[PDB]
Amino acid sequence: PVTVDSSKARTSLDALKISIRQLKWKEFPFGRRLPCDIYWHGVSFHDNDIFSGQVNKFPGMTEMVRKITLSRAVRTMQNLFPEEYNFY
C-alpha cells in the first residue's frame, strides 16, 4: 500500500484524510523514521528533511507566489510578449 505522510498537512489534513480513505491508502499522522512514498506538507518544502519519495511542495514556491516576484516575471514576459500577456 502507498504510504502518505500527513504530519504537516495543516489545513489540508481532513480533506486529504478522506481522500486517503477513498484510495485505501494507509497513513502516517505522526510520521516515521523510514522513507515514505508521499510527503504532504502545508506551507514550506523545507518542513521535513526528505531524501526520497514524493513531496507536495516544490522548493521555494512561497517566494515565487509573492506579489513582487510574480509581477517581475509578468513584466518580463510582457516585454517578451505584450499582446499575449495582457491579462495582467
Partner 1 sequence: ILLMKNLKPILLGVNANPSMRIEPSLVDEEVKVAVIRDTLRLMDPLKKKRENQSQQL
Partner 2 sequence: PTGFRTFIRSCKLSSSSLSMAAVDILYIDITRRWNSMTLDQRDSGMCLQAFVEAFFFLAQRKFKMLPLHEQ
Report the 10 Å Cβ neighbour count for 41: 20
In whole angstroms, the minimum distance from the beta carbon of 21 to partner 1 comes to: 10
The answer to whether 6 touches 41, Cβ cutoff 8 Å, is: no
Which grid coordinates belong to 40?
504532504
The answer to whether 61 touches 45, Cβ cutoff 8 Å, is: yes
| 26 contacts partner 2 (rule: CB under 8 A) | no
In whole angstroms, the minimum distance from the beta carbon of 71 to partner 2 comes to: 11
Q: How does DSSP classify residue 51? A: -
Q: Which does 18 bind (CB under 5 to 8 A by kind): partner 1, partner 2, none?
A: partner 1
Residues of the shown chain interacting with partner 1 in the complex, contacts defined by CB under 8 A: 2, 4, 11-12, 14-16, 18-20, 22-23, 25, 37-38, 42-43, 54, 56-57, 61-62, 64-65, 67, 70, 87-88
